Amino acid sequence: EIGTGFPFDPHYVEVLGERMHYVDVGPRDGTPVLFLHGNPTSSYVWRNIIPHVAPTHRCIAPDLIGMGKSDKPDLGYFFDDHVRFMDAFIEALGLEEVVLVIHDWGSALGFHWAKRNPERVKGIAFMEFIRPIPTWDEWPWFAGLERIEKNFIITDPRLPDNPIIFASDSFLQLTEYSREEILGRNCRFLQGPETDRATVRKIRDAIDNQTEVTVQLINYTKSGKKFWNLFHLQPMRDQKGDVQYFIGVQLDGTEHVRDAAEREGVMLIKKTAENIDEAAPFWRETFQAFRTTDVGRKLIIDQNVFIEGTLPMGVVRPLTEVEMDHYREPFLNPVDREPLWRFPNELPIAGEPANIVALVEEYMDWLHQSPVPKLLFWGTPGVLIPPAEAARLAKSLPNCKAVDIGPGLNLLQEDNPDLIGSEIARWLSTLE
Ligand SMILES: CCCCCCOCCOCCNC(=O)c1ccc(C(=O)O)c(C2=C3C=CC(=[N+]4CC(F)C4)C=C3[Si](C)(C)c3cc(N4CC(F)C4)ccc32)c1
Ligand SMILES: Cc1cc2nc3c(=O)[nH]c(=O)nc-3n(C[C@H](O)[C@H](O)[C@H](O)COP(=O)(O)O)c2cc1C
Ligand SMILES: [Cl-]
């Protein structure tokens, strides 16, 4: 299993009148590697990465102020507050040059620090980072829905060849493929020799006409088992009425009951498609409600929805109870939940807040002209970084090597720590 323990002795340092906790392991003479977590996590999100780096390099992972084992003073916990504390933390440890490993709001911290101190950053690994998000349409409404008891997939017709970017657990059961064997491919891989080609044209024509179609079709499991697949597809449109996704709903079994009962099956998958489409904007409207005072604080501070509801929906795989208690630990007291609510209100989406938008633009500009080595991880569908944006950055950023970690949402270290860690370790070998 992926590791659930946290086998690191605590270290502490006084920072602007407040105590911060950090992990500090590995050798001590060379360039240190600084790990910056974001919301709603802590140095715990790095627990299975650091062991890949520790044999060769020093590993420093602080808990942001207000989080983890660090003190919890009375602040607004604005991004500017975290900036002051991290500035002071780095100076308090005496750090000179560093390599950065950064995630979420840790990455706004790391990129903002590098822009102001470029000759001290010898390389940057980043994943799911803070970028200006132009429109709420780019926020994936489907994030974290893999366990919904409904057989459906989402395709992104704007990626080459309309690949699958989401597959519910049910769809894995039906086809016998794992999520890593499904995402990023066109759903036509389920077809085989006895698939009626005239039916495949009916699907191809309808998709080209951006229109719904319902068919029954011969498909194959990963193990070669033929089965009748009764499935319905239909587009989803964004706020401009343009198709940004297709939704597919499949019915379970080799059927063979695809007659008379077919009229009930057809009605069931059509009804499921409509119900999912009806709910998609409410799924996405949750973060918008977070970004409000009276409702957002009742959800996140009074109810703890960010820990109990958003955090598991940022991992494709299920988090165990042990792992959920580690993330719960700093926030058992409702009064300590301020940084959970202020972070999403700082996110630069659709131009607000203007001050954070400007700041992230400034360091994005820096990163585009900086020769510093860059290692970027991304998953499907991701949350902050959709695949298309990962692809764009892989070509825009100089000295950038991009790594696809497989299925992933926001806490990519939790879906595939062994790849992220080993990739970081080989990368570090190629540096100065
Ligand atoms: C730096 C950037 C950070 C990255 C952020 C990552 O973003 C990931 C996606 O964002 C999701 C935002 N949206 C919500 O959080 C949300 C919305 C609605 C619901 C809902 O129930 O309708 C919930 C929600 C729960 C919500 C609250 C819950 N309590 C409060 C008590 F403490 C328990 C429980 C669940 Si629940 C254990 C009954 C639950 C289950 C669920 N199905 C399980 C799986 F099959 C999907 C879906 C939603 C919930 C959650
Ligand atoms: C949302 C969606 C779901 C689909 N699901 C399946 C499926 O489950 N099985 C299948 O054989 N084809 C499925 N397809 C069809 C293929 O992806 C493809 O569009 C079809 O084979 C016609 O295209 P082609 O002639 O270029 O192969 C789906 C298409 C969409 C848009
Ligand atoms: Cl956030």
Author numbering: 3 to 434
What did the authors write?
By incorporating a light‐responsive protein domain into HaloTag, we engineer a tunable, photoswitchable HaloTag (psHaloTag), which can reversibly modulate the fluorescence of a bound dye‐ligand via a light‐induced conformational change. As the genetically encoded photoswitch, we selected the light‐oxygen‐voltage 2 domain of Avena sativa phototropin 1 (AsLOV2). Exposure to 450 nm light induces the formation of a metastable photo‐adduct between a cysteine side chain and the FMN cofactor, which leads to structural rearrangements and undocking and unfolding of the Jα helix.
The two psHaloTag1a molecules adopt a near‐identical conformation with a root‐mean‐square deviation (RMSD) of 0.33 Å (for 431 Cα residues). The extended Jα helix is in a folded state in both molecules and consists of about 1/3 HaloTag and 2/3 LOV domain residues. The FMN cofactors, JF635‐HTL fluorophore ligands, and Cl− ions were clearly visible in the electron density. Based on the density, both FMN molecules appear to be unbound to the adjacent C189 residues, and the folded helix of the LOV domain suggests crystallization of the OFF state. JF635‐HTL adopted the same position as analogous fluorophore ligands on HaloTag, and while the electron density around the dyes does not allow for unambiguous identification of the open or closed conformation, the open conformation resulted in the best fit. While we would expect a primarily closed conformation in solution for the OFF state, the observed open form could be explained by the tight crystal packing around the fluorophore, as the surface‐exposed dyes from the two chains face each other in the center of the asymmetric unit. The two performance‐increasing mutations E143W and A285W are in proximity to each other, and A285W to the headgroup of the JF635‐HTL fluorophore. These tryptophane residues could form an extended hydrophobic network together with neighboring hydrophobic residues (I150, L147, and additional residues towards the center of the protein), which could improve the stabilization/interaction of the fluorophore and improve performance. Overall, both the predicted and the crystal structures show that the HaloTag and LOV domains are tightly arranged and connected by a long helix, which ensures efficient propagation of the conformational change to the HaloTag in close proximity to the fluorophore.
